[PDB]
Amino acid sequence: GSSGSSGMNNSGADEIGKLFVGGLDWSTTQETLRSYFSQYGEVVDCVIMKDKTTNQSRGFGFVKFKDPNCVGTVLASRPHTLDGRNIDPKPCTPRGMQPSGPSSG
Numbered sequence: 001g002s003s004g005s006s007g008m009n010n011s012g013a014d015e016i017g018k019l020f021v022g023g024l025d026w027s028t029t030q031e032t033l034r035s036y037f038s039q040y041g042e043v044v045d046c047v048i049m050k051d052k053t054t055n056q057s058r059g060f061g062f063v064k065f066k067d068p069n070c071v072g073t074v075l076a077s078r079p080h081t082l083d084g085r086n087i088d089p090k091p092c093t094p095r096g097m098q099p100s101g102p103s104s105g
Contacts, residue, residue: 015020017044017068024048025085036082037063037089041070046086063089072104097105 019037026033034046065071069093074080080087 017065018092019063020090023087024057024059028083040074041065
């Protein structure tokens, strides 16, 4: 970059095969959520954050994938929308770029 400062590139094997879904719906459940993402990649672990008292899906969660490649496949299928709710997955990584490359299908 010329003006903006991007910085160096790091890998750090952490939250690679993880997928942070942003934009869930109080109705959205972990069961259905699993399959919804399972169609893309073998869901290993699905989590859906809920309220403290209401215990309702605030509007975000997580999704694990047997393979760290499954995450991308979905990131390319974006945007996303499950249970009549506009959602958007994330590689669970900080802003910036990655040397990953065109690696995708």
